[PDB]
Design a protein around this nucleic acid. Structure first.
Ligand SMILES: [Cl-]
Ligand SMILES: [Cl-]
Ligand SMILES: [Cl-]
Ligand SMILES: [Cl-]
Ligand SMILES: [Cl-]
Ligand SMILES: [Cl-]
Ligand SMILES: [Cl-]
Ligand SMILES: [Mg+2]
Ligand SMILES: [Mg+2]
Ligand SMILES: [Mg+2]
Ligand SMILES: [Mg+2]
Ligand SMILES: [Mg+2]
Ligand SMILES: [Mg+2]
Ligand SMILES: [Mg+2]
Ligand SMILES: [Mg+2]
Ligand SMILES: [Mg+2]
Ligand SMILES: [Mg+2]
Ligand SMILES: [Mg+2]
Ligand code: NA
Ligand code: NA
Ligand code: NA
Ligand code: NA
Ligand code: NA
Ligand code: NA
Ligand code: NA
Ligand code: NA
Ligand code: NA
Ligand SMILES: [Sr+2]
Ligand SMILES: [Sr+2]
Ligand SMILES: [Sr+2]
Ligand SMILES: [Sr+2]
Ligand SMILES: [Sr+2]
Ligand SMILES: [Sr+2]
Ligand SMILES: [Sr+2]
Ligand SMILES: [Sr+2]
Ligand SMILES: [Sr+2]
Ligand SMILES: [Sr+2]
Lengths: 142, 150, 142
RNA sequence: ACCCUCAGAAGGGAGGCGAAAUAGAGCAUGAAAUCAGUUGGCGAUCGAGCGACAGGGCAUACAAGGUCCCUUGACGAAUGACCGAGACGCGAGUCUCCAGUAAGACUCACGGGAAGCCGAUGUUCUGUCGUACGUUUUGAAAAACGAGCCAGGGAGUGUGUC
RNA sequence: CGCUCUAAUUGGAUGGAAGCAGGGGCGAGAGCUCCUGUGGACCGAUUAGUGACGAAAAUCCUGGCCAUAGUAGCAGCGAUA
């Protein structure tokens, strides 16, 4: 379905938390943001420990529940929510005006935000969001 | 007792009241609530269907433990309070009777206002175990009715 | 055909530059409600002020948000304290002989509630003739 | 009283008396807790000392309050620039001049505007702060003690001596 | 600051007192005061007195009232009617 975005961000080879922090800041300023190519988004560090943290979040829960997303679609969306006061009116409106996508459903190419890009030629210790999702058990639909 | 809580123009209106009725007040709120807006004749047919058990009265406020009824629309709980329905029929017999005497078409008149008020309790006492006694009271109900021309 | 008030209703006093400055200050600054602690929490506890005596009382200890405690620092300016919002000093009147000595430029008059329609009519006409405004006038059909 | 209704000396309706029946029989007045109906505000995706202070929505017969908004201008405490020019710094940036200038809370004046309009009141939304009250206690939101709610009642008094 | 009754001085009320309900104004505040409705006969102020004079609390007292709830009971017994 259509979503009229003011800003379209390209998450490809970009440090997740840094994109997320900027997308949150913009959503609270009234912008309708759309994060694109989230499967190709990046997160630094040793893969074994990163996956361990995300696997623990999946195993955590009870009857009240702890719904933790396995797909890179929802993982990026949850990362943004943690940077937004989603329980408050202004915060929920900001969050609901942000959507994360697998690939690029638009004709326009996304913009790469400043300070978010990771130089692959300078880094080897990082993981792609899709690689985390495959290890978590999600169905590769990208 | 009570007095009519709503203004009424005598030229286009018929009135009626019930005094110190020993019936359930909780049932009376539910019946009043449901018959309001209906025509006097529609209300008589409705209350007769309740006594027969063919039409349930929605219990929206006093419903703790009340089982669900399929015929209740927009709500779930309901019952068939015959005692208070028979008393409301006496109120509608009086109202339509007062109406016809004034030259109106009683049955066809709209129920503009209908409300039940708890006027008191007929005190009672029930012996319990351990040499103690507790209350066993009967509610005393008043109910006003204002019929109006369509 | 319509209702009209007796006397000089639209009359305003002549105050010095300083007394008008202080009157405008009292009106701007205002003061807090000064209602008793937790009056809103319990019906048996009225709005009337009582000093919070409790050793652990949040209001007594001056916790922010628990309401202002009565202090002398809250007093209105001496030069304007007790004046009617118009700027007039009030004089309570019971009869016609109570209007004597009243300066209609500085003071306005307030007829006591008990005083009946007969005596009120005589007080009102004698007040208008003496150039004194009646704060609580009779509204006659003119 | 009369009439209608009703199983009816009930009750109800209409009617009569009286200044007043909302003075109609435990019948002067008629508070609160609280109940029925109803009005305003909120409301079935959202968080809990229930508020105080700020600021917005919606709501308001009169009376007892009459203020309030916007251009501009005057005054102008502490504070206090942009731009530009000159000069330093690896750099972020800084010093000098412009300048204690423009600005600067309050208050006032001219012109224009508002009367649900300003205040105020009801409710609700946003911001800030906020785990009752009283008592016990070194330490009470306390998993320490008391209260279901309201009204009324409820605790330094007398004599003698010093 | 407020309450009771006494006194002196001095006022208000059937052209509507006290009380009560809702509302306006003042006082840092105790509280004062006005408007409207109700009520239908009493009510103040100042000064000097008087005191069975002020409540949110005491598992406080008495009365009234809500939720609990249209819920438990109206079955169980060698007499199942
Ligand atoms: Cl779970
Ligand atoms: Cl939040
Ligand atoms: Cl690396
Ligand atoms: Cl009941
Ligand atoms: Cl003082
Ligand atoms: Cl000023
Ligand atoms: Cl003492
Ligand atoms: Mg049941
Ligand atoms: Mg016994
Ligand atoms: Mg209260
Ligand atoms: Mg009475
Ligand atoms: Mg201890
Ligand atoms: Mg005197
Ligand atoms: Mg008392
Ligand atoms: Mg105490
Ligand atoms: Mg008791
Ligand atoms: Mg139960
Ligand atoms: Mg048998
Ligand atoms: Na990490
Ligand atoms: Na989980
Ligand atoms: Na149904
Ligand atoms: Na249905
Ligand atoms: Na408001
Ligand atoms: Na204690
Ligand atoms: Na405590
Ligand atoms: Na505790
Ligand atoms: Na009880
Ligand atoms: Sr940012
Ligand atoms: Sr219920
Ligand atoms: Sr009066
Ligand atoms: Sr009558
Ligand atoms: Sr929380
Ligand atoms: Sr200056
Ligand atoms: Sr009432
Ligand atoms: Sr006492
Ligand atoms: Sr009960
Ligand atoms: Sr049996």
């Amino acid at each position: 379905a259509e979503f009229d975005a003011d800003v379209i961000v390209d998450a490809r080879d970009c440090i997740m938390g840094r994109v997320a922090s900027q997308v949150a800041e913009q959503a609270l300023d009234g912008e309708t943001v759309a994060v694109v190519n989230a499967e190709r988004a990046v997160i630094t560090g040793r893969e074994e420990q990163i996956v361990e943290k995300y696997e623990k979040r999946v195993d955590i829960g009870n009857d009240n529940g702890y719904f933790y997303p396995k797909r890179p679609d929802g993982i990026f969306k949850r990362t943004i929510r943690g940077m937004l006061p989603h329980k408050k009116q202004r915060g929920r409106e900001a969050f609901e005006s942000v959507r994360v996508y697998l690939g690029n459903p638009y004709d326009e190419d996304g913009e790469v935000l400043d300070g978010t890009s990771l130089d692959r030629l300078s880094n080897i210790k990082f993981v792609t969001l899709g690689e985390i999702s495959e290890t978590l058990g999600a169905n590769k639909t990208w | 007792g009570i007095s009519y809580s709503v203004e009424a123009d005598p030229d286009t209106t018929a009135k009626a009241m019930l005094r110190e009725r020993q019936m359930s007040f909780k049932h009376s709120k539910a019946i009043a609530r449901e018959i309001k807006g209906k025509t006097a004749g529609e209300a008589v047919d409705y209350l007769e269907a309740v006594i027969e058990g063919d039409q349930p009265v929605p219990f929206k406020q006093h419903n703790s433990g009340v089982g669900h009824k399929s015929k209740v629309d927009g709500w779930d709980a309901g019952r068939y309070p015959e005692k208070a329905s028979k008393a409301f029929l006496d109120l509608l017999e009086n109202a339509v009777g007062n109406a016809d005497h004034q030259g109106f078409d009683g049955e066809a008149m709209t129920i503009k206002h209908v409300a039940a008020h708890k006027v008191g309790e007929q005190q009672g006492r029930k012996p319990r175990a351990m040499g103690r006694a507790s209350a066993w009271n009967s509610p005393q109900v008043d109910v006003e009715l204002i019929l109006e021309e369509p | 055909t319509e209702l009209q008030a007796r006397g000089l209703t639209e009359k305003t006093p002549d105050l010095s530059d300083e007394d008008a400055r202080l009157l405008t200050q009292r009106h701007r600054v205002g003061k807090p409600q000064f209602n008793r602690q937790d009056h809103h929490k319990k019906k048996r506890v009225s709005t009337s002020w009582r000093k919070p005596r409790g050793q652990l009382s949040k209001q007594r200890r001056g916790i922010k948000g628990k309401g202002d405690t009565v202090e002398a620092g809250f007093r209105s300016p001496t030069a304007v304290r007790g004046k009617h919002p118009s700027g007039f000093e009030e004089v309570r009147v019971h009869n016609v002989d109570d209007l004597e000595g009243v300066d209609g430029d500085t003071e306005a008059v307030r007829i006591a509630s008990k005083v009946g329609a007969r005596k009120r009519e005589r007080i009102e006409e004698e007040a208008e003739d003496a150039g004194i405004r009646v704060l609580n006038p009779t509204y006659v059909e003119v």
